[PDB]
Amino acid sequence: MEIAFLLNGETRRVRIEDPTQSLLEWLRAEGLTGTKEGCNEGDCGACTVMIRDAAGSRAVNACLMMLPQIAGKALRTIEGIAAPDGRLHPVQQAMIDHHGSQCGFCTPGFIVSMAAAHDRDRKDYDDLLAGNLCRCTGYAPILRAAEAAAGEPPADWLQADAAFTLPAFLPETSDALADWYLAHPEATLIAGGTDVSLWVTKALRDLPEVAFLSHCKDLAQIRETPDGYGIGAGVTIAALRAFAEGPHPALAGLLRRFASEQVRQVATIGGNIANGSPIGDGPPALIAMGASLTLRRGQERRRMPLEDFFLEYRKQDRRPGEFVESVTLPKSAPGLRCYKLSKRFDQDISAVCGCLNLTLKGSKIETARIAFGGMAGVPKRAAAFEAALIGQDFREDTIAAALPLLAQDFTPLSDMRASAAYRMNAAQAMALRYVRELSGEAVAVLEVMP
Amino acid sequence: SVGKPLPHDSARAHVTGQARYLDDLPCPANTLHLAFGLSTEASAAITGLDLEPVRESPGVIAVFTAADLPHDNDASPAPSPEPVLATGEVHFVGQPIFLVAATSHRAARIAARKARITYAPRPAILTLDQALAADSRFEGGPVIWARGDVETALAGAAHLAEGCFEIGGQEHFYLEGQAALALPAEGGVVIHCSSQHPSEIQHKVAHALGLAFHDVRVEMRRMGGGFGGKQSQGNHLAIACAVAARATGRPCKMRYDRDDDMVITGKRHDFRIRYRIGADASGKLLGADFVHLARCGWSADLSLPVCDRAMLHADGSYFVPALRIESHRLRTNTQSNTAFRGFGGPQGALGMERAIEHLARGMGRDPAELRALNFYDPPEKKTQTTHYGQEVADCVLGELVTRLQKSANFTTRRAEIAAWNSTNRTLARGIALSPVKFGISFTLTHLNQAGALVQIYTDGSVALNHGGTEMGQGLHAKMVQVAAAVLGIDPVQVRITATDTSKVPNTSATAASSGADMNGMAVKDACETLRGRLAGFVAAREGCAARDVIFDAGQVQASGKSWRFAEIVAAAYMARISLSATGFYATPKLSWDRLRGQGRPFLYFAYGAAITEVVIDRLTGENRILRTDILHDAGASLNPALDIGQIEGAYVQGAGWLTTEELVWDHCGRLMTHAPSTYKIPAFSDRPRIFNVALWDQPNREETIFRSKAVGEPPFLLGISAFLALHDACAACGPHWPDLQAPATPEAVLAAVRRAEGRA
Ligand SMILES: Cc1cc2nc3c(=O)[nH]c(=O)nc-3n(C[C@H](O)[C@H](O)[C@H](O)COP(=O)(O)OP(=O)(O)OC[C@H]3O[C@@H](n4cnc5c(N)ncnc54)[C@H](O)[C@@H]3O)c2cc1C
Ligand code: XAX
Ligand code: HPA
Ligand code: FES
Ligand code: FES
Ligand SMILES: [Ba+2]
């Protein structure tokens, strides 16, 4: 099998014989020593590369990226950020000037990460550089640098990659996928690969029969339907967050804190769903806004509410040959709110994920949709608490009066990320928060100005 | 060059990716890669070890038992033994029992798991309470130092406050993991490694192979971070590499993966501190009584000197007439804790900062005023001493705090919060000031020596080589700036070599913030010698006294004539004057009795202060810094810019230790937080939204390199500020004492709000 791409200006073709070899691997093996290793878990962006296609330029972790994904793309590694003549990117200079370097290790990652921001003219460095972390400098020097490098015109040589191109199954149409997946049930599906590649790098697992869904445009679709919005299973979180901005400012606000910008570009919605995580942050939002999932067993189409998809832990309503095709979320959901709670804000596994969405009819609670992540070993809606709230006053005291019913809805776990007591306690705390925020209280800690 | 804000020695090579670390380095087509096989049992006798499936795993060229090791199975920095490969029994979950050598790194990691090991498990010491109750401790008892009679002061102290609080550990999270390469250069070996201390790597490899020190050569260009982790825990890989190299005849490289790294190697000693602090009616402290319980792990490592520094810094920043520490060196079947930025100073100092704060709240006095009232006296007939009895006559904390609080607008903001608090019911703000007094020099005092070696080539251009090692602190930059300063030449003309045991022998670790101080002096010695040679030669050739030959701006001037530095060297070459010199330095005035707890361990102290503002969500415990104001004393800074940077990051890392970084073990001694997914260092958006770091510019009282002040470890202790401000936020909730614990994770923060509120 052969795939081609644009490696730092040069046109390169490659023969795939191992489909699961990461891009970090390939580069270092090839000699591109500028891309570094930090963990191979995606958390530290020491290997942030730059890719480009019909969509635009994006910053990704090379350690999560399987080679058959960059097929047809344009790749820029750290050793290829600077101009071919030798002139440094406005980002590289600003980083020299403003001392964004101490040990120099995370520097390649930031450079690439900042360069891609610089190219797409992006400025939310807080969220943008949240992927690659540094032990040394305290980020302040990098933040000054990025702001100084902002003023300078985009790298015109990096821009030149745009004109490009204009054994291990890779589908091009959603039919062709269902076609193939109808005959290969025991086939390892790779969308973004942000969970499957952690089985190969960390868990060290061999997986023949692989299929990259990251080449099916018709599976990665935003489409408007009479009832609401039909988001395809191939839609990336970054885009899902970008689309929510309008219709669902609350969902976007949660997706802000979904992994990093690096992982959000490649990690998908239907991947997150089909992954089936209880500490998965996608579902609780979608379940609190009553969004129907959609499956495909060839020419078959099931369409159940997402909460029904998750039965037991590690056990889902997947049939042999069935796959997640799309999700459907209704137009507006003004009462929805999402509360992520973890040791650190950016890029962390949430101990409790609180999603609340009621309607009013004056003061009386109409339809309650309270859903939780990480509270019991499956993302489920809180029934006893929910049944108590419906047909009651929307005041603090009444909501405080049904809080113990959550301790019957779940009986949380106690790992390194939270004691059950606190996990349970914060779950209750999110309900008081919801009544306070909606009444117009200052509840958000992140929104406070120095 | 000295005193200029010049950039890091590789800042361009950094920013372009061409800076090359150990794993980046090219090497022979036959280089094998190594992986440790790790014990899954916390305290067991290995009664079965079948490495048959390991050897049969593909790519595997060699697989090693402790029995296979030709010589010294020891890596410990202590005279106390610590094996590399387990000997008959295992002592913590993550102890390397064996060593795979495979044709690829991947392959060896795979084979490492394929081991068939049967353990005969014994009871295991995991908590301090167990260790202490089972007498699982080091040094054979606690260390006990007393100044005056605490008991008697507390008997009749007008105000006394007692408490007991936990201080968690800290993983290093250097971006470049532990790494080494061995090269069998016939007869002996050559070791390349990401190490803070090349000379101990030499020592340890030498012993493991059984060849005299002159046959082991250690080169070290840079590290991706060190922070204390690389100060010893290099020995294991560098032994593993040289032992496999010797045996397989091939060059052997080894690097941990993040998962291995945290499991195998040791972190910052977690402490428990009991405090009994007393004052009078005026506010002046009558004496403090401390007990340290230290989590040293299954092995000594650097636990001895670490807890000595903890006790030394038990004075915080304050004069105490009667002070007593009882420091316990406890052993547990967990990772052998090691060095970490501050080397124990942070731990002892935090116990003083928790005691002083708890006293302030108790007597209902403003902590800042109570701290101000209790500082050491400013210099200029009896000077105050510490609890170890070292005169403190370099303390500028009076002025510094006054300087900072004015610039940080301290009073207005604290009153501004009072109002903000009464308007809020879900969110609370906090603000606190924290002082720093940190002694500079090695606890163990003979390590206080540094060496250099300077070449001057016929084209003028010089080659610099010292004993210090680059982990990002910008050490070489300062050395280049000193070297260029002394010879009177452009820093361009100075080139830095990789650290070599064959260039500068018998180095110490690049530790205790001494690196820049002593090597600076070392460099200066060799440079002065060379500069003297050139001056003598000129004044002979030009007729006059050498004193009158001025070396400046790459130009030499004598007899009212001038040459370029280049022109003078070539001539002195032609004259046959040697253009190569060594330079040495050993820190003066140092003398103390560890077991007595008396003397002067330090040459001087480094001071600073930090004011931090934070917010806390009362419902969940979520938290974040809003502003930070630092005014650290760097003496006459060698590099203003580089220093300011160090102080920024040191603070961010300091606070990171007392906030979101948390180490967690299960009921079996298994590190549950062994990846970046579960260990949360400060991430970009965590930076103090308003971050004011300013220098205190006043020449060092002591004769240090260009009046400078070692700025490595000290500004780490500024992080306390954030922990205190977070407590100040909790104090604002209820009338009760919060009892906030380190680390102050959202959960631990909520638990303090909860106490102040009076719940559960
Ligand atoms: C650094 C890092 C940060 C992370 N942060 C978060 C986070 O903040 N919140 C969170 O919820 N998760 C997080 N994750 C884990 C998360 O499960 C994935 O990263 C992501 O959400 C899954 O999307 P993906 O496109 O990568 O799917 P993949 O990883 O490609 O797929 C994962 C599983 O889903 C299956 N699958 C994917 N797509 C389909 C489909 N269309 N039909 C049927 N099956 C499919 C795959 O076969 C596989 O079994 C993180 C992971 C990493 C490495
Ligand atoms: N960028 C960066 N800065 C850093 C470190 C680092 O790893 N990276 N480490 C330290 C430590 S930790 Mo210690 O006694 O070993 S416990 S000494 C020490 C230190 C060493 O630098 P000198 O002051 O000797 O030149 O500064 C700090 N600044
Ligand atoms: O202060 C120190 N830092 C690091 N190592 C040491 N060994 C003795 N003292 C020290
Ligand atoms: S390996 Fe550290 S994030 Fe890619
Ligand atoms: S510079 Fe040392 S890790 Fe970023
Ligand atoms: Ba470590």
TrEMBL record, chain A:
FAD binds at residues 189, 191-196, 259, 268, 272, 281, 324, 340. InterPro entries: 2Fe-2S-bd, 2Fe-2S-bd_dom_sf, 2Fe-2S_ferredoxin-like_sf, 2Fe-2S_ferredoxin-type, 2Fe2S_fd_BS, Ald_Oxase/xanthine_DH-like, Beta-grasp_dom_sf, CO_DH_flav_C. Residues 1-81 form the 2Fe-2S ferredoxin-type domain. [2Fe-2S] cluster 2 binds at residues 102-104, 106, 134-136. [2Fe-2S] cluster 1 binds at residues 38-40, 42, 44-45, 47, 63. Residues 167-334 form the FAD-binding PCMH-type domain. PROSITE patterns: 2FE2S_FER_1, 2FE2S_FER_2, FAD_PCMH. Keywords: 2Fe-2S, FAD, Flavoprotein, Iron, Iron-sulfur, Metal-binding, Nucleotide-binding, Oxidoreductase. Disulfide bonds join 103-136. This is Xanthine dehydrogenase. It comes from Rhodobacter capsulatus.
UniProtKB/TrEMBL annotation, chain B:
Ca(2+) 3 binds at residues 171, 265. Keywords: 2Fe-2S, Calcium, Iron, Iron-sulfur, Metal-binding, Molybdenum, Oxidoreductase. Ca(2+) 4 binds at residues 171, 265-266. Its EC number is 1.1.1.204. SMART domains: Ald_Xan_dh_C (SM01008). Ca(2+) 1 binds at residues 171-172. Residues 16-123 form the Aldehyde oxidase/xanthine dehydrogenase a/b hammerhead domain. This is Xanthine dehydrogenase. The gene is xdhB.
